[PDB]
Amino acid sequence: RVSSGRDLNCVPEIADTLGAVAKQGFDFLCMPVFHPRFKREFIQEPAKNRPGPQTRSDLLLSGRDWNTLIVGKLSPWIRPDSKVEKIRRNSEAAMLQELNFGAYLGLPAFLLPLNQEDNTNLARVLTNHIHTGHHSSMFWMRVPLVAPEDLRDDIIENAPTTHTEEYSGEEKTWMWWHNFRTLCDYSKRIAVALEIGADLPSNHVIDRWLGEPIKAAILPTSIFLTNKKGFPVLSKMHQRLIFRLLKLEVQFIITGTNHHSEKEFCSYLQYLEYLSQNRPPPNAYELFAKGYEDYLQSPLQPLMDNLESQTYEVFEKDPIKYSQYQQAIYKCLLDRVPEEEKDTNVQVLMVLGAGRGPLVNASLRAAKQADRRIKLYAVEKNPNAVVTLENWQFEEWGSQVTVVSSDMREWVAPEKADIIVSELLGSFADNELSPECLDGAQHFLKDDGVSIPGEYTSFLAPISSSKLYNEVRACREKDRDPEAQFEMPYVVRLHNFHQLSAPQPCFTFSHPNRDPMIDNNRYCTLEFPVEVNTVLHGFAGYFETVLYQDITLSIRPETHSPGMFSWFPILFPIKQPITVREGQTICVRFWRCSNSKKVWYEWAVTAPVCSAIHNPTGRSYTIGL
Amino acid sequence: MERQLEAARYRSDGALLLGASSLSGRCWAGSLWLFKDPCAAPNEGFCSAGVQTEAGVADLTWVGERGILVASDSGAVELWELDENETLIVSKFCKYEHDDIVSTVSVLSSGTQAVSGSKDICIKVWDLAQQVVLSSYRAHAAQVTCVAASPHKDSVFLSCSEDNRILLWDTRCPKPASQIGCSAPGYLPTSLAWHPQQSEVFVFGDENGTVSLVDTKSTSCVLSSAVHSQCVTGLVFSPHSVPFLASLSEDCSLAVLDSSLSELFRSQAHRDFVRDATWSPLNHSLLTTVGWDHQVVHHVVP
Numbered sequence A: 001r002v003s004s005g006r007d008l009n010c011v012p013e014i015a016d017t018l019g020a021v022a023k024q025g026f027d028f029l030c031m032p033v034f035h036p037r038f039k040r041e042f043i044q045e046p047a048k049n050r051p052g053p054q055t056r057s058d059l060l061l062s063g064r065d066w067n068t069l070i071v072g073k074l075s076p077w078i079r080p081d082s083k084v085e086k087i088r089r090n091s092e093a094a095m096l097q098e099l100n101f102g103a104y105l106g107l108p109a110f111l112l113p114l115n116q117e118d119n120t121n122l123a124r125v126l127t128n129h130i131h132t133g134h135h136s137s138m139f140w141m142r143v144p145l146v147a148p149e150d151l152r153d154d155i156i157e158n159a160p161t162t163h164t165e166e167y168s169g170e171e172k173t174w175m176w177w178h179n180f181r182t183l184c185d186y187s188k189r190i191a192v193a194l195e196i197g198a199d200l201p202s203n204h205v206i207d208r209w210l211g212e213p214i215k216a217a218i219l220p221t222s223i224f225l226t227n228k229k230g231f232p233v234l235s236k237m238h239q240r241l242i243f244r245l246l247k248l249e250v251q252f253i254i255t256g257t258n259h260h261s262e263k264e265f266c267s268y269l270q271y272l273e274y275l276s277q278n279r280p281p282p283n284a285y286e287l288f289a290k291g292y293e294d295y296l297q298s299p300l301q302p303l304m305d306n307l308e309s310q311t312y313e314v315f316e317k318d319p320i321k322y323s324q325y326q327q328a329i330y331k332c333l334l335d336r337v338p339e340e341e342k343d344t345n346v347q348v349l350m351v352l353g354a355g356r357g358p359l360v361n362a363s364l365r366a367a368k369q370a371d372r373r374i375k376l377y378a379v380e381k382n383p384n385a386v387v388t389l390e391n392w393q394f395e396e397w398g399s400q401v402t403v404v405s406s407d408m409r410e411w412v413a414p415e416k417a418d419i420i421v422s423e424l425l426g427s428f429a430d431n432e433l434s435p436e437c438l439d440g441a442q443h444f445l446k447d448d449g450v451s452i453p454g455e456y457t458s459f460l461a462p463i464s465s466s467k468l469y470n471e472v473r474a475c476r477e478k479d480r481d482p483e484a485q486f487e488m489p490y491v492v493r494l495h496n497f498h499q500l501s502a503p504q505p506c507f508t509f510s511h512p513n514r515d516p517m518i519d520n521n522r523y524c525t526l527e528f529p530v531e532v533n534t535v536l537h538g539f540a541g542y543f544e545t546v547l548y549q550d551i552t553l554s555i556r557p558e559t560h561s562p563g564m565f566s567w568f569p570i571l572f573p574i575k576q577p578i579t580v581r582e583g584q585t586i587c588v589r590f591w592r593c594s595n596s597k598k599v600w601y602e603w604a605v606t607a608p609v610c611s612a613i614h615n616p617t618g619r620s621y622t623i624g625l
Numbered sequence B: 001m002e003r004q005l006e007a008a009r010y011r012s013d014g015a016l017l018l019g020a021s022s023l024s025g026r027c028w029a030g031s032l033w034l035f036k037d038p039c040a041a042p043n044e045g046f047c048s049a050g051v052q053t054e055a056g057v058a059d060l061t062w063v064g065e066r067g068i069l070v071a072s073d074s075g076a077v078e079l080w081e082l083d084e085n086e087t088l089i090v091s092k093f094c095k096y097e098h099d100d101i102v103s104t105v106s107v108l109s110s111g112t113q114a115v116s117g118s119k120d121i122c123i124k125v126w127d128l129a130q131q132v133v134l135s136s137y138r139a140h141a142a143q144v145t146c147v148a149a150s151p152h153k154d155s156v157f158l159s160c161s162e163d164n165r166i167l168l169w170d171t172r173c174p175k176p177a178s179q180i181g182c183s184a185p186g187y188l189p190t191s192l193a194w195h196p197q198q199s200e201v202f203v204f205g206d207e208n209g210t211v212s213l214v215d216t217k218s219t220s221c222v223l224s225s226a227v228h229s230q231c232v233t234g235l236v237f238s239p240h241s242v243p244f245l246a247s248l249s250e251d252c253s254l255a256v257l258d259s260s261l262s263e264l265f266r267s268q269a270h271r272d273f274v275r276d277a278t279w280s281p282l283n284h285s286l287l288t289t290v291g292w293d294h295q296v297v298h299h300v301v302p
Ligand SMILES: C[C@H]1CC[C@H](c2ccccc2)N(C(=O)C(=O)Nc2cncc(C(N)=O)c2)C1
Pocket: A297, A298, A299, A300, A314, A315, A316, A423, A424, A425, A426, A427, A432, A491, A565, A566, A567, A568, A569
């Protein structure tokens, strides 16, 4: 259920007021740290020398309460971007004062409004404060979905509200954030508290706030409709938005007085509670990955490295993948061994990268399901895993399975195979070097032999996420290129991101690859239609594979194999985010590269602007052969 | 009594009404006091009647002779009825209808209706009799600084806001509000005074310490002067036959001006922000200012 706080601009007795909101059901309070109306002078005598105290005492709460329950608010008289020199200088000193007091109390967050277009000095002062010794305090920029000027009642007879489509104009609120955010150099302590008005704007405006670090959603009591009984509720369109924000696990703030004066304040709250408990409950994928949301991990290299026990264990905890593998083998046996030949034709069947042998079991289950004879090899170069196979082979499989403990590129096989069954696929299909592995293993396939899988294909899609772009930025390590972290892919359950175009295919590979001029390097150009204003932060990678005929695996969200949680998408970031105006095309270029020892990807954006070529010569990221 | 004096309003008969807020310390409350001896203020011990509000007071106005209309931090507008003997001050109504600090109130020429201006950007028209909101107008784009009723018309009043708009209202039009003021976007309006004997003209003070004289009819800035070094927080016209203009400021100074805004008197007796001013209805050369320095000064105006 919902982590939710109360916004007040009036606190007569902090002890009582906090007592009230906690009984109402709130988890925290947003309140001013100095009285909102108590303007203060810093330069000009006499008001300069106003006797103190300048606010209530820090002794009024436990450090515990301050650290956990109280979000500060910048006094609304503080205006660092005033046109008046005196109000600027005064507000500068006033703003440092209010922030430094928030820091002194160790407040978990402090609220600051964006409600005009020019917040340049506001950003400077915040940024100045931020670089004054590394403190944990968060800053919540209060930004409206809709700028108050564009929400106002059409009641000025000589300044009417324009009734004309202003696509970019209706997004101007996001540009406020974007500028402020950019000026403050993408600080991790600067998040969005998104203020929702009475009337929602066009979806494209709401969609601009995907990929953005929304920590808060502010709901004024105003925007609540009233049902028959008397309870406050929200429109069906407001309800859609709440569901979008709940999956971002934002904290919900409630601002403004009670306009449903029959019900307590636990009413407004209890609706949000009713909404969260009444949502589509988490499916198999969503429940498995509920921890990994936007968690950057380096891509596994099962070739160059030896996978740990618990790694193989989760590969194996995926019944849909092995259902599909079992079937793919089942269909191939029948197509190869006519019914009349069942007891006279035994099939030579070679798992390549058998790990702890879930494919070996699938290969048995698939043979007694199709009533045909099979002879099993289990090739596995990971000697730690080969321990687990040989213990299976002795305890259970018997002489049927002939465990081989070597590289499929090296192994001199006794006989050739009818079927080579592999699992060497990464989130980007070919990024674990299934191509190079099944190429060195092709010579011991019979001239009429199948590979399962026979085809895989990688898919790229451009994304916007100033969130994930900040997570990658955060990955700078000493003793290497300061930008190296942008020139490498990450496996990541993408979430709080914006797909800007439909995935297109990048690289396809066939097995067997009978081709006389076997080359596994690639140059693919992609052109992405983009129908929104947004900011490019990188490319999501997915894959599809044909196991046999019409049995397939996909993590491509459109065609995603249902309930299969072995692969998360990959992310190819870029160093500088790229502005993309509605109707413009994102042109990206990808190269798969290799020498004798390494395989790697280089990538570039060529439109609407050119990026730098990422990871040239594999300097920042390579994959070991 | 609280340290920060916000409001100071003389009644018909010469009694002094004081609104005051706690703007620092443990309790951030407010209070309303009446002083039948105007020379006895600010002293609590020699007061005719006083009371504690739930929370501070941003603006205050008389509702006739026993009526006090209050703009509460709480987002409530409060009507306080005086006692039948004028010893007590009793809460008539307290209606939580704004979503943020009520920052300004003004009573309309009739006196059964009034208009509030909140930091929630909305302006509302009130029935003081029925105790409900008649109209709710979101005309502005920023927190509403000041609303001032027409002296003589119920349907007409000014408002100004941090959105730089000065709105002339007229509740008779289907689009009530109308945007007037100088040629270019000057500095923000802060304070509005109607002229008492030309319901066609008014004066506004800005945040840059400039007071300006405006003709609605002619909608052109006839005249202005650089009176204060800082924001102009209040403007009151003298009850005089040919009136004087009193300008309050955050520069802690009172100035009194003629009809061409030339400087006549100037008082730095205050050593904190000058908040309010009312003219003595008994001696039209006495003027009573309050400030955030808890002082109640009585000035003699040549
Ligand atoms: C589901 C998560 C936990 C496992 C793994 C991981 C764990 C630690 C770091 C990096 C990724 N992961 C992957 O997306 C992945 O790489 N899968 C994979 C790779 N290769 C082969 C197979 C397979 N056939 O099962 C699966 C994310």
